[PDB]
Design a protein around this motif. Structure first.
Motif, PDB file in Angstrom:
ATOM      1  N   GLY A   1      43.936  44.732  44.474  1.00 15.15           N
ATOM      2  CA  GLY A   1      44.434  45.315  43.251  1.00 15.15           C
ATOM      3  C   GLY A   1      43.852  44.729  41.980  1.00 15.15           C
ATOM      4  N   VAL A   2      43.638  43.418  41.935  1.00 13.71           N
ATOM      5  CA  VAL A   2      43.097  42.779  40.740  1.00 13.71           C
ATOM      6  C   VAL A   2      41.589  42.977  40.708  1.00 13.71           C
ATOM      7  CG1 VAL A   2      43.037  40.570  41.955  1.00 13.71           C
ATOM      8  CG2 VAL A   2      42.890  40.628  39.463  1.00 13.71           C
ATOM      9  N   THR A   3      41.071  43.393  39.552  1.00 13.04           N
ATOM     10  CA  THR A   3      39.660  43.722  39.405  1.00 13.04           C
ATOM     11  C   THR A   3      38.898  42.791  38.477  1.00 13.04           C
ATOM     12  OG1 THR A   3      40.228  45.319  37.671  1.00 13.04           O
ATOM     13  CG2 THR A   3      40.017  46.151  39.923  1.00 13.04           C
ATOM     14  N   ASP A   4      39.554  42.217  37.470  1.00 16.65           N
ATOM     15  CA  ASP A   4      38.865  41.339  36.535  1.00 16.65           C
ATOM     16  C   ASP A   4      38.329  40.108  37.257  1.00 16.65           C
ATOM     17  OD1 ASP A   4      38.100  40.214  33.904  1.00 16.65           O
ATOM     18  OD2 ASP A   4      39.761  38.829  34.275  1.00 16.65           O
ATOM     19  N   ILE A  11      42.651  33.361  41.137  1.00 17.79           N
ATOM     20  CA  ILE A  11      43.454  33.603  42.374  1.00 17.79           C
ATOM     21  C   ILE A  11      42.780  32.876  43.550  1.00 17.79           C
ATOM     22  CG2 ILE A  11      44.203  35.385  44.008  1.00 17.79           C
ATOM     23  CD1 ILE A  11      44.599  37.286  41.754  1.00 17.79           C
ATOM     24  N   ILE A  12      41.462  33.038  43.698  1.00 18.44           N
ATOM     25  CA  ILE A  12      40.719  32.383  44.816  1.00 18.44           C
ATOM     26  C   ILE A  12      40.880  30.861  44.693  1.00 18.44           C
ATOM     27  CG2 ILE A  12      38.433  32.010  45.831  1.00 18.44           C
ATOM     28  CD1 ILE A  12      37.674  34.791  44.630  1.00 18.44           C
ATOM     29  N   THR A  13      40.663  30.312  43.494  1.00 20.51           N
ATOM     30  CA  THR A  13      40.735  28.847  43.308  1.00 20.51           C
ATOM     31  C   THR A  13      42.084  28.358  43.783  1.00 20.51           C
ATOM     32  OG1 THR A  13      39.240  29.099  41.520  1.00 20.51           O
ATOM     33  CG2 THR A  13      40.453  27.014  41.584  1.00 20.51           C
ATOM     34  N   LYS A  14      43.158  29.041  43.379  1.00 25.77           N
ATOM     35  CA  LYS A  14      44.530  28.637  43.784  1.00 25.77           C
ATOM     36  C   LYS A  14      44.675  28.788  45.304  1.00 25.77           C
ATOM     37  CE  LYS A  14      45.976  30.745  39.433  1.00 25.77           C
ATOM     38  NZ  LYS A  14      46.661  31.896  38.842  1.00 25.77           N
TER      39      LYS A  14
END
Length: 100
Positions: A1-4, A11-14
């Motif tokens: 859903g997230v595109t930016d 998100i990946i880092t977390k």
């Protein structure tokens, strides 16, 4: 859903730290979860932007005992046990705790 791209990177880092902890701590004893989480938190603190190194505080946190104090050099702080006062004087070597 997230595109930016920035949001996705965050998100990946977390999720990297989260999934690493979830996969590893499931294979460690419950007493060792806190150690790995502490190491992961230190890694994130190293990688984050806008926070000091905190190396001195961390170094002290690790080898506070090394701070040598001569026998009798440690003043007896009222209401503080002898080992507590020893730790207080050892902590006072840091500039932040000079007036401790």
């Amino acid at each position: 859903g997230v595109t930016d791209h920035t949001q996705r990177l965050c998100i990946i880092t977390k999720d990297l730290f989260q999934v690493a902890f979830n996969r590893v701590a499931r294979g460690m004893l419950h007493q060792d979860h806190i150690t790995f989480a502490m190491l992961l938190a230190r890694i994130k603190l190293k990688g984050t932007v806008g926070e000091p190194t905190y190396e001195a505080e961390f170094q002290h946190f690790l080898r506070g005992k090394e701070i040598v104090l001569s026998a009798g050099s440690t003043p007896k702080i009222p209401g503080l046990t002898v080992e507590q006062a020893e730790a207080v004087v050892r902590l006072s070597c840091l500039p932040a705790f000079k007036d401790l």
